[PDB]
DNA sequence: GACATGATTGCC
DNA sequence: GCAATCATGTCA
């Protein structure tokens, strides 16, 4: 509640907001009442039409990801592989999100462990975009649901950052090379270190 | 309707 | 190194 970053705080361009999300703790309240949290430590942006690494490249809009062309703090879930999922935040700018890729798990560790079974070393339990969905019991029901005004889901304030290429993007094109990934330097709980980048 | 494929994960 | 597994994007 009366820490739920708002509708303002969203409303920023891909990449500020995906480094502003660093330090931020995503929490999902089951329907026990138990909440969940985990500091997010892993963020990847994408520009919109113009990123060619993205689903919006080239103004593809679908049914399926109108979330990143609806107001900011708007989520965008969607199913890959047919088998798992991940969780975008949409920010300003029609087609542009950031994709949540590794949080530190903060609270409600035993059921993220539960979650994520279908004995896992806590940091196995939230290090990637598809695991952090399925420790938080997030799916495709929370496709479109607003971060800023949802029972459910929210962000609540924060309490070094390394820029890097992105995770998935193949080996081709400018795009795939630009360091639109950000994480916390150090930082354990992040997926896919990237020690080159590390060097400054 | 048909067909190729994935912003991953995890076992071989 | 590679299989699991199916909704979506595309073409028809
Ligand atoms: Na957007």
Known sequence: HLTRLGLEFFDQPAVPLARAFLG???????????????????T?????????????????????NRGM???????????????????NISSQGDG????????????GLET?????????????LCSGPSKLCQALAINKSFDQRDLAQDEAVWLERGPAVVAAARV???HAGEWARKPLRFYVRGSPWVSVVDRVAEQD
């Open 24 to 42: 931020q703790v995503l929490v999902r309240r089951l329907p026990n009442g138990t909440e969940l949290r985990g500091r997010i430590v892993e």
């Open 44 to 64: 990847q942006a994408y520009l919109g039409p113009e990123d060619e690494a993205a689903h919006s490249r080239g103004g593809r809009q679908t049914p399926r």
């Open 69 to 87: 062309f609806m107001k900011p703090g708007t989520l965008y879930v969607y199913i890959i592989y047919g088998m798992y999922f991940c969780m």
């Open 96 to 107: 542009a999100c950031v994709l949540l890729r590794a949080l530190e798990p903060l609270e």
């Open 112 to 124: 993220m462990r539960q979650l994520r079974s279908t004995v896992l070393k806590d940091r196995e």
């Open 168 to 170: 998935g993007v193949g």
